[PDB]
Amino acid sequence: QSDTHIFIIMGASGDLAKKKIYPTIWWLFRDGLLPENTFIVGYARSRLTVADIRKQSEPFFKATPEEKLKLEDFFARNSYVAGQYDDAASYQRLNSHMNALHLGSQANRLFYLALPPTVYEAVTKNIHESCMSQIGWNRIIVEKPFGRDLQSSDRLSNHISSLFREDQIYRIDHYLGKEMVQNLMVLRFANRIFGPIWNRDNIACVILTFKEPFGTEGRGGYFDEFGIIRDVMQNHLLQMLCLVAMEKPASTNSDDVRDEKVKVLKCISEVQANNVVLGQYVGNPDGEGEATKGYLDDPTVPRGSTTATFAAVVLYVENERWDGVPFILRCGKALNERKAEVRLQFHDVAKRNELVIRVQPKLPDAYERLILDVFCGSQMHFVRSDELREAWRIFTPLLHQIELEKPKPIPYIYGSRGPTEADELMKRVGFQY
Amino acid sequence: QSDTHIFIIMGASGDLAKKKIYPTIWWLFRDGLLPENTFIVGYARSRLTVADIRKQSEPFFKATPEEKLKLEDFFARNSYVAGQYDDAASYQRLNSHMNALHLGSQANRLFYLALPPTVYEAVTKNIHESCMSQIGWNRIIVEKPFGRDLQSSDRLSNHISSLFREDQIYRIDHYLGKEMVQNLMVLRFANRIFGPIWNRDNIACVILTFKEPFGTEGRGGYFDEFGIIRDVMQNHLLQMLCLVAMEKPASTNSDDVRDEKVKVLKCISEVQANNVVLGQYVGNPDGEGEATKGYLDDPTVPRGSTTATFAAVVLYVENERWDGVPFILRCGKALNERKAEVRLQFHDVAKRNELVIRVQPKLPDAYERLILDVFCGSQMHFVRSDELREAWRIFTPLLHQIELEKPKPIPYIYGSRGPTEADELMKRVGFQY
Ligand SMILES: NC(=O)c1ccc[n+]([C@@H]2O[C@H](COP(=O)([O-])OP(=O)(O)OC[C@H]3O[C@@H](n4cnc5c(N)ncnc54)[C@H](OP(=O)(O)O)[C@@H]3O)[C@@H](O)[C@H]2O)c1
Ligand SMILES: NC(=O)c1ccc[n+]([C@@H]2O[C@H](COP(=O)([O-])OP(=O)(O)OC[C@H]3O[C@@H](n4cnc5c(N)ncnc54)[C@H](OP(=O)(O)O)[C@@H]3O)[C@@H](O)[C@H]2O)c1
């Protein structure tokens, strides 16, 4: 709204800030992609200085010796405030420090909640009363997990949105690849092209695939508390199902396309276990490297976890355009390839034909383009509150059933395509009407 | 029309019969794909016996020792008649020999003109009066060249069709690959699918590609009398342009789809030299094998031939569906890859997007399926007389200009993508309307 932006990294001492946030804002500043008059303010309990953050974070900058002048300028625009996350006087110190900066009264304020959502409720509250800007805009970036089921997510989201309008809430998701936004970009363009063709009439079956060739790799501990449905399917695969099935948006406003996505979601009823095949990856005997270790063989995994590392799920959009048309969401870790495709099978009058859409896995990458979108205010590649609510409604009964019955997942060897029961399930839904 | 078929190989002593016709009918008979009561009658001037043909042709059968019983039966259904191609008594001997066979009076008669078209005028005449069947159907297979320009082709075609109805004339073309019919099959299916999308509105540019990685290889002599336009473009690439641009056929009759193809051709005006880039391949210095030899370095090529071995051409379909939409026909020998694709570029509102259709280069191959089509009477993958006339009309002014002015083709190294002037020409027709 003006020329002066303050980038507040709430929880600047942590892993996400050290390894990712600080490096990518350094890159955006270096490549000249930030607003010229930008200040960076870390905020966290541990008593640090800008020098400490530089010490522990510049290793990840890939800083070359001919970049040292812009790098010194960058850290000259940097500052750090210690404080507690529910302490009034602490947020007072933060707010007045920001007011002290050049044009800071005025300035736009972008809060990055690099914190476990467990503290979100406190932070979003205190910001709301203490640190919001009176002139410039205020935009909060919230991070996964957006809850773990419909109930928890509704609690967290109702809290956040009772304090900020939806054009201030940016739910960010970026851990699946540098090519991650181009996926949705080309699926939007492809929906615009192929709209008149994408019917129940021409299409018999739609499969969306996210295969990764690596395992959990010494971090199965974190993954185990969520599952492959929460990690890849409920958020990403579901959005690209939306982008495939949606109608022509009213325009290219972020909100018309998000309206169409939510209109899609409101016609998918809740997925049930018979339409689901869960799998867990085991070590490769004859392979080598991280392949000799399986999932349970990761030290950080609790003994005997039934957490699925692979899932195949069948959804149905239930309107006049798509009915009895099965949408097959297939994803998993430690597979054969690193594939991220969308196939659409057709009705022949001949073998059987099929259209394929692949991201071969514009120079700003996924997370970089996302931070630039929050700067520009382009909310397109962020999930809206109702979109999130509908996703969680679709998947919560199933996740609850898993957590209750601990259904033993189907084992598959590191490097396999996955359980053959998944191919069984695909073969089963040859609807033919 | 019954159960008894007589396969007459006119000119059975020659290369096409020895190396291809006799082997593939052996394969069709072996795999049980011929009518049960089929007889094979070779006819040619040189005084041979069935034993001689077996001697000189079984080497190409890939006959295994457990196939010798069906092979003996096959040659038991074989017979050979010597005669001249414009000698009345010779065709009398042929006709009465056929009448002597079991049910031969009755029998369907399939004449394969394995002969240089220079004698076609005689053969088709004599057959017409002497050897046609009174009960069964009569079908003639004519072979390339179908003339070399509009005038010669009209002469030969008017002669052939003043004696046979068009549902008796099968113009066969099969020298570009075993996967050659599946190309047109999938392009027909794709036109049926994407019809509502293929407009001037969504598509900005359509390119059709036929790259081969090998040279002429010791046979540049034959190629040199025709050119890459006559070899690949005027016949094959042009038909698949037809299959892309055509309207929805009235049905799946061979003749409704061929009607739509001809309707396409009648709206392409004659290609002119400024929209054409000709190229000729030279030896690869640092490569090896047939790559060290160029085109002129083939001994069978006349010294100093300007014959193009690569051509890039721009056509325009001129109706309401396609207007100012450039169709780029790009083909050539001794290139980098063995690609056979169709690309369709779109109109963005973003880089630039594009749909691709590739034959990855149903168990009966190209030529095998073609002979089975002439048996079944499926004229779909054969060019009709008006289709041929229109193709020749499109390309004859250009070919005449080349033969007159001997324009020195652009040299390109064995293994290259081709002349960069071809990429220039593609870049030039960014129409933008
Ligand atoms: N794939 C994924 O889903 C994924 C991957 C990476 C990160 N994330 C998300 O990124 C966000 C940031 O995570 P992170 O990687 O930066 O980890 P983090 O180190 O746990 O959090 C960063 C900072 O949070 C503060 N903190 C952590 N636990 C706390 C607690 N219980 N009470 C109070 N303060 C606490 C600490 O600051 P002080 O000690 O100075 O107060 C710490 O330096 C989280 O929401 C996480 O879910 C998600
Ligand atoms: N890519 C292509 O375009 C391509 C490739 C291969 C073949 N073809 C076509 O296939 C057809 C058959 O050709 P082919 O490969 O079998 O070659 P071919 O050996 O020239 O012809 C086969 C037989 O034709 C007879 N013959 C040849 N020239 C003659 C002449 N001037 N007068 C009378 N009889 C003559 C001979 O039989 P007798 O001596 O016993 O009478 C010879 O054994 C031709 O139309 C040719 O264009 C096209």
Instruction: Decide: helix, strand or coil at residue A1.
Output: coil
Of A197, A348, A350, the CB nearest to B194: A197
Minimal C-alpha gap between B193 and chain A (Å): 7
In our burial notation (b when 16+ CB lie closer than 10 A, e otherwise), range A395-429 reads: bbbbbeebeeeeeebbebbbbbbbbeebeebbeeb
Q: CA quadruple A261, A262, A266, A270: dihedral positive or negative?
A: positive
CA distances to A115, A129, A144, A304, B179 from A118, rounded to whole Å, are 8, 19, 11, 27, 61
CA–CA dist A322, A244 (Å, integer): 11
Rounded to the nearest whole angstrom, what is the distance from the C-alpha of residue B46 to the centroid of ligand 2?
13
Whether the CB-CB separation of B212 and B334 falls below 8 Å is answered with yes
B343 appears as a binding residue in the annotation: yes
* A194 touching chain B per CB within 8 A: yes
CA distances to A182, B78, B353 from B350, rounded to whole Å, are 12, 66, 9
Instruction: Decide: helix, strand or coil at residue B188.
Output: helix
Pocket of ligand 2 (CB under 6 A): B 11, 13-17, 44-46, 114-119, 143-145, 175
Which is it for strands B203-211 and B340-346: parallel, antiparallel or unpaired?
A: antiparallel
Instruction: Decide: helix, strand or coil at residue B361.
Output: coil
Of B190, B197, B350, the CB nearest to A193: B197
Interface of B with A in 149-188 (CB under 8 A): 186
Instruction: Please pick, among B5, B97, B236, B381, the residue that the annotation labels catalytic.
Output: B236
Instruction: Please pick, among A5, A97, A236, A381, the residue that the annotation labels catalytic.
Output: A236
Tokens of A348: 């022949």
- Cα(first)–Cα(last) distance of chain A, in Å? 54
Instruction: Decide: helix, strand or coil at residue A63.
Output: coil
* A100 touching chain B per CB within 8 A: no
Preferred mutation among A193, A345, A355 to probe B, highest tally of B CBs within 10 A = A193
Minimal C-alpha gap between A184 and chain B (Å): 13
Atom of ligand 2 nearest to the CA of B13: 43
A87 lines ligand 1 (CB under 6 A): no
Minimal C-alpha gap between B207 and chain A (Å): 19
Where are the domains positioned within chain A?
4-143, 180-428
Nearest C-alpha in A relative to B346: A193
* A252 touching chain B per CB within 8 A: yes
Whether the CB-CB separation of B309 and B176 falls below 8 Å is answered with no
* A353 touching chain B per CB within 8 A: yes
* B88 touching chain A per CB within 8 A: no
Ligand 1 atom 7, closest CA: A16
Burial label for B95, CB within 10 Å (0-12, 13-18, 19+), is buried
Minimal C-alpha gap between A189 and chain B (Å): 8
Experimental structure resolution, Å? 3.1
CA distances to A253, A328, B26, B29, B143 from B40, rounded to whole Å, are 71, 53, 10, 11, 19
A270-A275-A281 Cα angle (round to 5) = 115
Q: Which residue, A403, A372, A387, is CA-closest to A153?
A: A387
CA–CA dist B173, B212 (Å, integer): 17
* A253 touching chain B per CB within 8 A: no
In our burial notation (b when 16+ CB lie closer than 10 A, e otherwise), range B338-366 reads: eebbbebbbeeeeeeeebebebeeeebbb
Nearest C-alpha in B relative to A348: B189
CA distances to A280, B81, B246, B309, B338 from A228, rounded to whole Å, are 10, 74, 47, 55, 41
- The residue whose CB lies within 8 Å of the most ligand 1 atoms, and thus the one to mutate among A16, A20, A232, is A16
Question: Taking the C-alpha atoms of A158, A378, A180 and A160 in order, what is their torsion angle to the nearest 10 degrees?
Answer: -10
Nearest C-alpha in A relative to B347: A193
Side-chain half-sphere exposure of B171, counting CA atoms within 13 A:
23
A 10 A CB-CB count for B387 gives 22
CA–CA dist A395, A149 (Å, integer): 8
- The residue whose CB lies within 8 Å of the most ligand 2 atoms, and thus the one to mutate among B115, B123, B144, B152, is B115
Q: What is the DSSP string of B34-94?
A: S-SEEEEEEEESS---HHHHHHHHGGGS---GGGHHHHHHHHHTEEEEE--TT-HHHHHHH
State the structure-solving technique. Answer: X-ray
A 10 A CB-CB count for A239 gives 22
CA–CA dist A60, A38 (Å, integer): 21
Tokens of B314: 């721009």
Say yes or no for a CB contact (<8 Å) between A350 and B189.
yes
Known active-site residue A236: yes
Chain A positions in Cβ-Cβ contact with residue B202 (cut-off 8 Å): 193
Nearest C-alpha in A relative to B345: A193
Whether the CB-CB separation of B140 and B109 falls below 8 Å is answered with no
Q: CA quadruple B306, B307, B313, B317: dihedral positive or negative?
A: positive
- The residue whose CB lies within 8 Å of the most ligand 2 atoms, and thus the one to mutate among B53, B90, B121, B143, is B143
CATH of domain A4-143: 3.40.50.720
Rounded to the nearest whole angstrom, what is the distance from the C-alpha of residue A94 to the centroid of ligand 2?
93
* A to B CB pairs, distance under 8 Å: 32
Which is it for strands B310-316 and B326-332: parallel, antiparallel or unpaired?
A: antiparallel
Preferred mutation among B183, B189, B253, B362 to probe A, highest tally of A CBs within 10 A = B189
Whether the CB-CB separation of B237 and B208 falls below 8 Å is answered with yes
Whether the CB-CB separation of A103 and A37 falls below 8 Å is answered with yes
B417 appears as a binding residue in the annotation: yes
* B226 touching chain A per CB within 8 A: no
Helices and strands counted in chain A (H then E): 15, 13
Say yes or no for a CB contact (<8 Å) between A196 and B193.
no
Domain A180-428's class? Answer: alpha beta
Chain B positions in Cβ-Cβ contact with residue A189 (cut-off 8 Å): 348, 350, 353
Sheet with A138-142: strands ordered across: A78-82, A37-44, A4-10, A108-113, A138-142, A169-171
Preferred mutation among B184, B185, B194 to probe A, highest tally of A CBs within 10 A = B194
